Design a protein around this motif. Structure first.
Motif, PDB file in Angstrom:
ATOM      1  N   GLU A 267       0.827  -1.199   0.000  1.00 31.12           N
ATOM      2  CA  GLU A 267       0.000   0.000   0.000  1.00 31.12           C
ATOM      3  C   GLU A 267       0.861   1.248   0.000  1.00 31.12           C
ATOM      4  N   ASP A 268       1.776   1.354   0.965  1.00 35.15           N
ATOM      5  CA  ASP A 268       2.695   2.481   0.987  1.00 35.15           C
ATOM      6  C   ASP A 268       3.481   2.581  -0.309  1.00 35.15           C
ATOM      7  N   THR A 269       3.904   1.445  -0.865  1.00 33.59           N
ATOM      8  CA  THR A 269       4.626   1.498  -2.133  1.00 33.59           C
ATOM      9  C   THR A 269       3.778   2.129  -3.234  1.00 33.59           C
ATOM     10  N   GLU A 270       2.499   1.757  -3.317  1.00 32.54           N
ATOM     11  CA  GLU A 270       1.695   2.158  -4.471  1.00 32.54           C
ATOM     12  C   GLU A 270       1.084   3.544  -4.318  1.00 32.54           C
ATOM     13  N   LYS A 271       0.654   3.925  -3.111  1.00 27.99           N
ATOM     14  CA  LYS A 271       0.001   5.223  -2.961  1.00 27.99           C
ATOM     15  C   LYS A 271       0.983   6.355  -3.218  1.00 27.99           C
ATOM     16  N   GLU A 272       2.265   6.107  -2.981  1.00 28.40           N
ATOM     17  CA  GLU A 272       3.311   7.087  -3.218  1.00 28.40           C
ATOM     18  C   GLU A 272       4.449   6.424  -3.978  1.00 28.40           C
ATOM     19  N   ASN A 273       4.541   6.734  -5.265  1.00 31.11           N
ATOM     20  CA  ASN A 273       5.625   6.263  -6.113  1.00 31.11           C
ATOM     21  C   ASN A 273       6.386   7.450  -6.668  1.00 31.11           C
ATOM     22  N   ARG A 274       6.283   8.585  -5.983  1.00 32.34           N
ATOM     23  CA  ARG A 274       6.913   9.825  -6.410  1.00 32.34           C
ATOM     24  C   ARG A 274       8.331   9.972  -5.883  1.00 32.34           C
ATOM     25  N   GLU A 275       8.566   9.584  -4.626  1.00 32.27           N
ATOM     26  CA  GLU A 275       9.908   9.629  -4.064  1.00 32.27           C
ATOM     27  C   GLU A 275      10.845   8.619  -4.712  1.00 32.27           C
ATOM     28  N   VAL A 276      10.307   7.586  -5.371  1.00 32.63           N
ATOM     29  CA  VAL A 276      11.144   6.646  -6.107  1.00 32.63           C
ATOM     30  C   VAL A 276      11.364   7.077  -7.550  1.00 32.63           C
ATOM     31  N   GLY A 277      10.992   8.299  -7.904  1.00 31.48           N
ATOM     32  CA  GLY A 277      11.184   8.845  -9.233  1.00 31.48           C
ATOM     33  C   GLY A 277      12.517   9.547  -9.386  1.00 31.48           C
ATOM     34  N   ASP A 278      12.601  10.415 -10.394  1.00 30.81           N
ATOM     35  CA  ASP A 278      13.819  11.160 -10.684  1.00 30.81           C
ATOM     36  C   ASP A 278      13.446  12.531 -11.236  1.00 30.81           C
ATOM     37  N   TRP A 279      14.457  13.261 -11.706  1.00 32.68           N
ATOM     38  CA  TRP A 279      14.281  14.608 -12.227  1.00 32.68           C
ATOM     39  C   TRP A 279      15.052  14.753 -13.533  1.00 32.68           C
ATOM     40  N   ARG A 280      14.656  15.749 -14.332  1.00 32.74           N
ATOM     41  CA  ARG A 280      15.270  15.940 -15.644  1.00 32.74           C
ATOM     42  C   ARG A 280      16.707  16.437 -15.523  1.00 32.74           C
ATOM     43  N   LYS A 281      16.947  17.406 -14.642  1.00 30.58           N
ATOM     44  CA  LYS A 281      18.272  17.990 -14.421  1.00 30.58           C
ATOM     45  C   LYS A 281      18.815  18.603 -15.717  1.00 30.58           C
ATOM     46  N   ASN A 282      18.149  19.669 -16.154  1.00 29.68           N
ATOM     47  CA  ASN A 282      18.526  20.374 -17.370  1.00 29.68           C
ATOM     48  C   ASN A 282      19.812  21.173 -17.151  1.00 29.68           C
ATOM     49  N   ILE A 283      20.370  21.690 -18.245  1.00 34.49           N
ATOM     50  CA  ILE A 283      21.622  22.435 -18.218  1.00 34.49           C
ATOM     51  C   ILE A 283      21.498  23.652 -19.136  1.00 34.49           C
ATOM     52  N   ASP A 284      22.099  24.763 -18.703  1.00 35.53           N
ATOM     53  CA  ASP A 284      22.145  25.990 -19.492  1.00 35.53           C
ATOM     54  C   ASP A 284      23.312  25.977 -20.476  1.00 35.53           C
ATOM     55  N   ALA A 285      24.511  25.655 -19.984  1.00 39.81           N
ATOM     56  CA  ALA A 285      25.686  25.317 -20.785  1.00 39.81           C
ATOM     57  C   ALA A 285      26.343  26.511 -21.476  1.00 39.81           C
ATOM     58  N   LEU A 286      25.727  27.696 -21.404  1.00 40.22           N
ATOM     59  CA  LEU A 286      26.343  28.937 -21.895  1.00 40.22           C
ATOM     60  C   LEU A 286      26.807  28.807 -23.347  1.00 40.22           C
ATOM     61  N   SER A 287      25.848  28.662 -24.266  1.00 40.70           N
ATOM     62  CA  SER A 287      26.157  28.331 -25.656  1.00 40.70           C
ATOM     63  C   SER A 287      26.824  29.469 -26.426  1.00 40.70           C
TER      64      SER A 287
END
Lengths: 56, 57
Positions: A25-45
């Protein structure tokens, strides 16, 4: 002779699958903390020109 | 003299800009190599962890 062991098996499966169930139940009601993020970059082109500030 | 001095300030400015372009492009050759190695390392690690996951599988 067929009912008593059946009931005992129901109780055992209930307890085990139910601890499994309460944790799943705890696993399924919240599966957001087991996710990730895009982590974009500006890179100064802009390696064609420089900046305005005195440090640059 | 003014023409050479000006041709120079322009060759020199174009140079500072080309050198800057190279500096920034190089800053990025390096930032890219850092990301490439970070990602190649994460990839090799993903593959080490995959080989491990497969071994653990």
């Amino acid at each position: 002779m067929q009912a008593l062991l059946g009931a005992r098996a129901k109780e055992s499966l209930d307890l085990r699958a139910h601890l499994k169930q309460v944790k799943k139940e705890d696993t399924e009601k919240e599966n957001r903390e087991v996710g990730d993020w895009r982590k974009n970059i500006d890179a100064l082109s802009g390696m064609e020109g420089r900046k305005k500030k005195f440090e640059s | 003299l003014d023409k050479y001095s000006e041709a120079l300030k322009d060759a020199q400015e174009k140079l500072e800009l080309a050198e800057k372009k190279a500096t920034d492009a190089e800053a990025d050759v390096a930032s890219l190599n850092r990301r490439i190695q970070l990602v190649e390392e994460e990839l090799d690690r993903a593959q080490e962890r995959l080989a491990t996951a497969l071994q653990k599988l």
